[PDB]
Amino acid sequence: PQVQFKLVLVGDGGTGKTTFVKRHLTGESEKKYVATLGVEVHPLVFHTNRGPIKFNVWDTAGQEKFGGLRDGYYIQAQCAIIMFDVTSRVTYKNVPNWHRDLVRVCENIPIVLCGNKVDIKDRKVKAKSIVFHRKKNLQYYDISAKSNYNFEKPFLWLARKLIGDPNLEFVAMPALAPPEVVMDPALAAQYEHDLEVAQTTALP
Amino acid sequence: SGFGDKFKRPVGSWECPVCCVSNKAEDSRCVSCTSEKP
Numbered sequence A: 001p002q003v004q005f006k007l008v009l010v011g012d013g014g015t016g017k018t019t020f021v022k023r024h025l026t027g028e029s030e031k032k033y034v035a036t037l038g039v040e041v042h043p044l045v046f047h048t049n050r051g052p053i054k055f056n057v058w059d060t061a062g063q064e065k066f067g068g069l070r071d072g073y074y075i076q077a078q079c080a081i082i083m084f085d086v087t088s089r090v091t092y093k094n095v096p097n098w099h100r101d102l103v104r105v106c107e108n109i110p111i112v113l114c115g116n117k118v119d120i121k122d123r124k125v126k127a128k129s130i131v132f133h134r135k136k137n138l139q140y141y142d143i144s145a146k147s148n149y150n151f152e153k154p155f156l157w158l159a160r161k162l163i164g165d166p167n168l169e170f171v172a173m174p175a176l177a178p179p180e181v182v183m184d185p186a187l188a189a190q191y192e193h194d195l196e197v198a199q200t201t202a203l204p
Numbered sequence B: 001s002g003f004g005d006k007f008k009r010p011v012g013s014w015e016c017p018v019c020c021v022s023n024k025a026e027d028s029r030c031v032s033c034t035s036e037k038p
């Protein structure tokens, strides 16, 4: 038997959930289609200092555009990612809804909040605005699916919570699709400096 | 120590061949996607 976790990947349509999970090349080529739910399960293997961990990532077929997701999608989820678009303020305002929809079925499973598309210059949702994770004591990460920026951070955090081992490390990065856009290393350092500053600012 | 050294599926459980969710022995269908216990 293998150590695998069902990871539900939720968020508004157009936030980049499918682009994100597709970065993991073997998860993409070995994804499984669930006809009854219209879902694709990407087996995302990660290799830790204590062995392989497989995140079976559930990705929608775009049904989130027309309403909430059915129970079956959430059932037995052991962890989750809530994604939003840093270029669409409205997607950030729906994070609480997705959070509620998720906890209504799965209770206090580990959750990571991800703001996608940080490779874009015209960033609308800045670090100072992102506060929901602090209210619910969740972990947040900037990411850019199309540049593989911080791709492994959410999965590393989840694995540590799920295993109960804060010293857990990925010994090697999974084979990822080549970056389709460049992520200015400085812009990444500036965004990372904006998060730590925002982390040391009071909640309004 | 490795997880696999101390990891074991609950007695009677079965992984769903369609969506990989782990189900109880008594369940004839998958509690997530409704597929049948193969």
Ligand SMILES: Nc1nc2c(ncn2[C@@H]2O[C@H](COP(=O)(O)OP(=O)(O)O)[C@@H](O)[C@H]2O)c(=O)[nH]1
Binding pocket: A011, A012, A013, A014, A015, A016, A017, A018, A019, A020, A062, A116, A117, A118, A119, A120, A143, A144, A145, A146, A147, A181
């Ligand atoms: N610049 C940039 N564009 C992205 C990124 N991720 C997705 N896009 C685009 O956002 C649109 C929606 O992508 P998709 O993965 O289908 O979002 P989903 O509805 O949540 O599955 C598409 O046009 C993507 O090409 C990113 O990380 N950076």
Ligand SMILES: [Mg+2]
Binding pocket: A017, A018, A019, A060, A061, A062
């Ligand atoms: Mg999609």
Ligand SMILES: [Zn+2]
Binding pocket: B016, B017, B018, B019, B020, B021, B030, B031, B032, B033, B034, B035
């Ligand atoms: Zn199933």
